[PDB]
Design a protein around this ligand. Structure first.
Ligand SMILES: Nc1ncnc2c1ncn2[C@@H]1O[C@H](COP(=O)(O)OP(=O)(O)OP(=O)(O)O)[C@@H](O)[C@H]1O
Ligand SMILES: Nc1ncnc2c1ncn2[C@@H]1O[C@H](COP(=O)(O)OP(=O)(O)OP(=O)(O)O)[C@@H](O)[C@H]1O
Ligand SMILES: Nc1ncnc2c1ncn2[C@@H]1O[C@H](COP(=O)(O)OP(=O)(O)OP(=O)(O)O)[C@@H](O)[C@H]1O
Ligand SMILES: [Mg+2]
Ligand SMILES: [Mg+2]
Ligand SMILES: [Mg+2]
Lengths: 476, 471, 56, 470
């Protein structure tokens, strides 16, 4: 039959006896009204994970089979609401009023169903858009130590997506609830919430919901994706999903591994991250996109969970604390951060203006290390060392201040083409702001051409505009 | 029935068989009261808390007092509820154990006074309130580099004997006099000498009338030490919600809550992970620390001391707790031995309030600029360790001179240090603290010697301390 | 010049003695950290092996 | 004679065959169920046997998800190992682990020959071991670790350092010219790269001479384990029966070793070393000893290996190192400095750097470069603490030349067109020897060092300097 009884209860994990027709991955309902998922099926005991408060479930309570595989609610009504991993409203404001459901154990789009990613995701941060580009459907990893600015680079991205017909999801895994309310109030102030969905799994919840939260978040976005509209997803910590599985598993009694992690860490992370894709024109040309996070103890790139996730994603953005304390913000180590799709995800102007930049900011980093040990140097090295410093300045940018792409290409054109050399280093950050003002009042034609064509205007005209401003600017 | 029997005893852990169909809930409390019926046997009073359902009508229970004397077959009564702690105005001025009983020898709490449970669910998203204003402690290093926040969590990390309790006593002295509100002091794993010492400090001050104290100490069985933090917080939660008063909650060592769980978790039959820690570390810590929050009704500010197990920060317990804290100061043993008191790491300590908006632009350019000078000094640590300062050139020489000035000018004279060094203490207001750093950074005090910059309050004090030397 | 060159060589000699003494002290301090670590790793690998062996 | 499921333990399943006509190890089974009621889900599954337990019961590893599996279902015994289409029918088409065509191009007929995936390895009576040199056009490999035609070649590196990019440069060059079948397989392959490679083969026209097996990172471990053996049975049929010479490309063979671990505990095996299977060297041997060039015909084999945690002292890489003829090791420290391809010129060694198999002039120059770069490694410690000006003229001239040699090992690839703007270069071997000899003899030492990065021939370096103004 379809009824059983709980025999062991502890630490959120339960075993039941009976329930003969259950499937792996089913939903099961206890008497208290708390729901559960079957993950193991021995000859005499079914192994069930509780998805709610377990302080009311006693031995000898009944448990009954729903008949459904694990399903997350989807629909247009979820947009602008704060929700649980299960489809349950949290912000107050009443029901979510969804229409249909999707499995959380979907198959990924296969080979022969995908296209090369061929369209930008303009974040509005100079270093990311110029050096480490992202295109719709390319997975990109933000990895850094605690308190280095990682959350900011994500929130700034959602805010600078208002014009495009984008839908964004923020999944908060393991975060203290006060912080999530702070993020939501921040989005509401910048007007971002109108096109976003927030999914919350606070540190007080049983680890099973922490484990389900990322899957629920992609399950919600793929609905839009197969319908054609483009989507972006952010996972606030995948390193807290890993910790949560380790408890869910060590508890289940599955033996340990490297550290105490199971071996199925790579499967878990692959299952989630491979549902991100750019579908082809036959499928209607949608896109999912993903931004997972990973925190590393002592700021180390070489470790078990960091290298597993660095193996799956289509690039990485590594943020360093020692750069952060030395005045470079947002601090991105250019030597350790590379993008696999870089070059296809840019407007034609940015490809031409800024192609050798990621390597360039790497030769300066090495030539700085050697010359701190070289005493006197020659002319070709004194010239080049200067460019890297001029570049590290131009790459700096404060919090909650977006720069449009047309302005990024023009300041990088001074930087790559080299008219910027005359200005002392200390005045470079200031020179930028005055240049943006001058460009808005006078140079509407050059920006018009960039918005119109996605290409660079005639060199003589650009040289004329920039040389003329170099008359107006005043310097030390 | 409600009566159940003991079946196994295993240090802290005990196993209780119940009648079919009448088992206790998963955090419910039980009673053993036994009178010796023969010379061989001994008499007992004990209470136990349910922790797992083991099958075969068996519930596994952690204990709240020593299980010596337990004879298999000792009978058990069922309270029907979690451990219930007396709450209301009657708590003020009193000293308590985990069971809720008064240990102060001033009487016993009237049986009709309302007692609420220890284990209650955490506060909802709709209720929580987020705001920022700055709390002023008069301690130089906190006020510039990592400022504390009203209504937040404040965490003090450090290894064995590195200065956690003295900084807590200086915070109590300045803040609880100025607070105008309720305080709770909760001691988990606190050296007993301190408990006799403080009770006397609070009575002599007259501050006792507005505060309540829970103690469970290094001598007590492991079970009692876990539940003591939860006990202190149910009293504090009544003061924030129903009285509506603002509250301070002080915890003496929060590390012992995880450590006590580590010992009992292994005997409960769970498997172990990482460096021997339990398989439920994140969830157990988070369940306690999410309750400690500011709300629309009122605010709690909590000051916590974290013992690092060895001088190892990467160890699983200290690092799981870092995420839940708003402002953090990390004391370092190597500085303590140089003579820098308090021994705060200037570059490792972080707080959400060093934002140009919250602390203001002036307090901001100055804070980051201090960090930039100090970080360069760490890079130059491993060169100057061998050759000395002949290898250094130009900017390297000027940077090391100013770093030496800064690192000694972050050290202070405390009123609580008077019991160790004969000097009087100093309180430095924030406007003075920010102003002082600027003149050191500009180079206006380049001439004065480094030994004049130690254990002083406001900047002027350095000029008179130099003039005493004449160097 | 005879005082200047005699006093130089002497200066280099003094610095090099102190430099070598600082380096040799750092070698014993570093060597103990390596031994402490080697002992630590060995215990970890053994305990992870035996924890899985106890489970199975 | 049918069977019944008893335990479903994630990836593993346990089937008890009551007839007493149990199956065989390496055999494959079938689970085909149509849903009786609305609650159930339709299932189509294959499972490969692993172990005979006591109570008439057999452990099996699945080749699809065990979602929707209900205790008591029916298992049909094929009586054979997994069987794969082999013949000209494979040329130009892409298949899954079971030989079913993934591509939309069509469906293979049931009249076609199929061969079994499992087979004993070739024997000492009929292996062979002649040496020739395979030209690539990549400077580091063509000088310091020449690939041998008909031999095993291995690319080792830690995560995100260029393994996939270097495979795409070799396939552009070696694929078009070679006149024999070329099989490419993808154990644990990033999908966004499997799809890109199909369109790259279609652009050039290499597709008519190729066959592909894809197994993605998202499949159940069982599928990732057997996707190497499927590619190998196709390549074996072309070697033995047709007799044409062949290339095999296997992508991330570590993911084969990693899958075994996941299934080891649920099979009932006790753990060994750093959470690894008790049978690591065995399984690697069975797969690797099939990949040989016999008296009948030659398989040139190129493989990518992922170094599990940036630790070359780990069991999976160490055991693998014993089975190769040439190896290039990739280092993240070089990748941080921007020297691409990031190849260790000391740790990369091949059995063919012998005077007879490459010539006296080649060998002289190669070992002399390896002395210069080992001398630069020890000298960097002294420079880092004491400073470069402190040292002798011979020590200064070593650091001078070693900087130039290390940057001149970098090269502009065609697959670096997308990553670096500049189009790309192919350097013939004779040219590479001339140029490296000039650097060692000091003729080009006047030029500034920044001109040696991402370039192909030494002629180009002279012009690149002219633009700088030297
Ligand atoms: N460009 C910038 N200029 C100045 N300050 C900056 C800049 N970018 C970030 N910051 C500051 O750096 C800090 C970043 O805090 P935040 O919590 O966002 O970091 P995080 O590394 O994402 O945190 P977590 O470790 O919790 O993920 C804040 O003080 C923020 O204002
Ligand atoms: N500000 C200070 N002024 C004078 N002495 C100090 C100061 N800070 C630390 N010390 C000295 O160092 C020791 C610190 O003792 P303390 O009671 O603060 O240790 P603790 O870190 O709280 O101990 P524990 O780790 O066990 O909790 C004492 O000997 C004390 O005199
Ligand atoms: N020859 C090259 N020239 C320029 N950039 C290169 C070159 N080779 C690699 N890179 C850079 O390094 C990246 C390496 O990514 P890739 O996925 O190939 O790494 P991998 O080591 O193969 O990954 P995995 O180990 O997970 O399979 C490229 O996408 C590119 O950014
Ligand atoms: Mg964050
Ligand atoms: Mg103390
Ligand atoms: Mg790769």
């Amino acid at each position: 039959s379809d009824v059983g009884t709980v025999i062991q209860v502890g630490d959120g994990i339960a075993r039941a006896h009976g329930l003969d027709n259950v499937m792996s991955g089913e939903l099961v309902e206890f008497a208290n009204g708390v729901m559960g998922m079957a993950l193991n099926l021995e000859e005499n005991n079914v192994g069930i994970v509780i998805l709610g408060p377990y302080t009311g479930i006693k031995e000898g309570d009944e448990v009954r089979r729903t008949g459904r595989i694990m399903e997350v609610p989807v629909g247009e009504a979820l947009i602008g609401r704060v929700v649980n991993p299960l489809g349950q409203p949290v912000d107050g404001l009443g029901p979510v009023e969804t229409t249909e459901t999707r499995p959380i154990e979907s198959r990924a789009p296969g080979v022969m169903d995908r296209r090369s990613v061929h369209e930008p995701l303009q974040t509005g941060i100079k270093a990311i858009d110029a050096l480490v580009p992202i295109g719709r459907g390319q997975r990109e990893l933000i990895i850094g130590d605690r308190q280095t600015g990682k959350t900011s680079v994500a929130i700034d991205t959602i805010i600078n997506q208002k014009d495009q017909n984008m839908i964004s999801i923020y999944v908060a895994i393991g975060q203290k609830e006060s912080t999530v309310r702070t993020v939501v109030e921040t989005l509401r102030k910048h007007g971002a919430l109108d096109y976003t969905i927030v999914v919350t799994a606070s540190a007080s919840q049983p680890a099973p919901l922490l484990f389900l939260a990322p899957y629920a978040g992609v399950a919600m976005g793929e609905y839009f994706m197969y319908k054609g509209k483009h989507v972006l997803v952010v996972y606030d910590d995948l390193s807290k999903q890993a910790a949560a599985y380790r408890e869910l598993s060590l508890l289940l009694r599955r033996p340990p591994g490297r550290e105490a992690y199971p071996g199925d860490i790579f499967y878990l992370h692959s299952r989630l991250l491979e549902r991100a894709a750019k579908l082809s024109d036959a499928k209607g040309g949608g896109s999912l996109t993903a931004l997972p996070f990973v925190e590393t103890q002592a700021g180390d790139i070489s470790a078990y969970i960091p290298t597993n996730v660095i193996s799956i994603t289509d690039g990485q953005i590594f943020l360093q604390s020692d750069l952060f304390f030395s005045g470079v913000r947002p601090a991105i180590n250019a030597g350790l951060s590379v993008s696999r799709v870089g070059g296809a995800a840019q407007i034609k102007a940015m490809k031409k203006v800024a192609g050798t930049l990621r390597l360039d900011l790497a030769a300066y980093r090495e030539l700085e290390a050697f010359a701190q040990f070289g005493s006197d140097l020659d002319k070709a090295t004194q010239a080049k060392l200067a460019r890297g410093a001029r570049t590290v300045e131009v790459l700096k940018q404060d919090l909650h201040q977006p720069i449009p792409v047309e302005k990024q290409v023009l300041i990088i054109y001074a930087l790559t083409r080299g008219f910027l050399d005359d200005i002392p280093v200390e005045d470079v950050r200031r020179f930028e702001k005055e240049f943006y003002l001058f460009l808005d009042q006078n140079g509407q034609h050059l920006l018009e051409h960039i918005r119109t064509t996605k290409d660079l205007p005639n060199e003589d005209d650009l040289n004329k505009a920039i040389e003329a401003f170099k008359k107006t600017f005043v310097v030390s | 029935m409600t009566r159940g029997r003991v079946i196994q005893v295993m240090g802290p852990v005990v196993d209780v068989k119940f009648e079919n169909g009448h088992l206790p809930a998963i955090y419910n409390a039980l009673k053993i009261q036994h009178k010796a019926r023969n010379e061989n046997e001994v008499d007992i009073d004990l209470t136990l808390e349910v922790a797992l359902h083991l099958g075969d009508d068996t519930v596994r229970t952690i204990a709240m007092a020593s299980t010596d004397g337990l004879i298999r077959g000792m009978e058990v009564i069922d309270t029907g509820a979690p451990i219930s702690v007396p709450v209301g105005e009657v708590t003020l001025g009193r000293v308590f154990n985990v069971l809720g009983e008064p240990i102060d020898l001033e009487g016993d709490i009237p049986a009709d006074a309302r007692r609420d449970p220890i284990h209650r669910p955490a506060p909802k998203f709709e209720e929580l309130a987020t705001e920022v204003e700055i709390l002023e402690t008069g301690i130089k290093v906190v006020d510039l580099l990592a400022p504390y926040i009203k209504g937040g969590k404040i965490g003090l990390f450090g290894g064995a004997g590195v200065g956690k309790t003295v900084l807590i006593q200086e915070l109590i002295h300045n803040i609880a006099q100025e607070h105008g509100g309720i305080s709770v002091f909760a001691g988990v794993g606190d050296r007993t000498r301190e408990g006799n010492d403080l009770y006397h400090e609070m009575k002599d001050s007259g501050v006792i009338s507005k505060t309540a104290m829970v103690f469970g100490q290094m001598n007590e069985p492991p079970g009692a030490r876990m539940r003591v933090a939860l006990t202190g917080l149910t009293m504090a939660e009544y003061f924030r919600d129903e009285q509506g008063q603002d509250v301070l909650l002080f915890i003496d060592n929060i590390f012992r809550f995880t450590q006590a769980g580590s010992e009992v978790s292994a005997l409960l039959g769970r498997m172990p992970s990482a460096v021997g820690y339990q398989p439920t570390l994140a969830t157990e810590m988070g369940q306690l620390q999410e309750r400690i929050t500011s709300t629309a009704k009122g605010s709690i500010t909590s000051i916590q001391a974290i013992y690092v197990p060895a001088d190892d920060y990467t160890d699983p317990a200290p690092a799981t707790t870092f995420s839940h804290l708003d402002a953090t100061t990390n004391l370092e043993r190597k500085l303590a031995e140089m003579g820098i008191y308090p021994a705060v790491d200037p570059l490792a300590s972080t707080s959400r309030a060093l934002a140009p908006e919250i602390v203001g632009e002036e307090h901001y350019q100055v804070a980051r600029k201090v960090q930039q000078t100090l970080q360069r000094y760490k890079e130059l640590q491993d060169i100057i360790a061998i050759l000395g300062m002949d290898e250094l050139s130009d900017e390297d020489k000027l940077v090391v001179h100013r770093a030496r000035r800064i690192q000694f000018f972050l050290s202070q004279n405390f009123h609580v240090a008077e019991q160790f060094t004969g000097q009087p203490g100093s309180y430095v207001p924030v406007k003075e603290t920010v102003r002082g750093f600027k003149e050191i950074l500009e180079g206006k005090y380049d001439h004065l010697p480094e030994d004049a910059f130690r254990l002083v309050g406001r900047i002027e004090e350095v000029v008179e301390k130099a003039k005493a030397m004449g160097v | 010049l005879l005082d200047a060159k005699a006093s130089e060589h002497a200066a280099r000699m003094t610095a090099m003695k102190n430099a070598t003494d600082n380096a040799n002290e750092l070698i014993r301090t570093l060597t103990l950290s390596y031994n402490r670590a080697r002992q630590a790793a060995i215990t970890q690998e053994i305990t992870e092996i035996v924890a899985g062996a106890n489970a199975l």
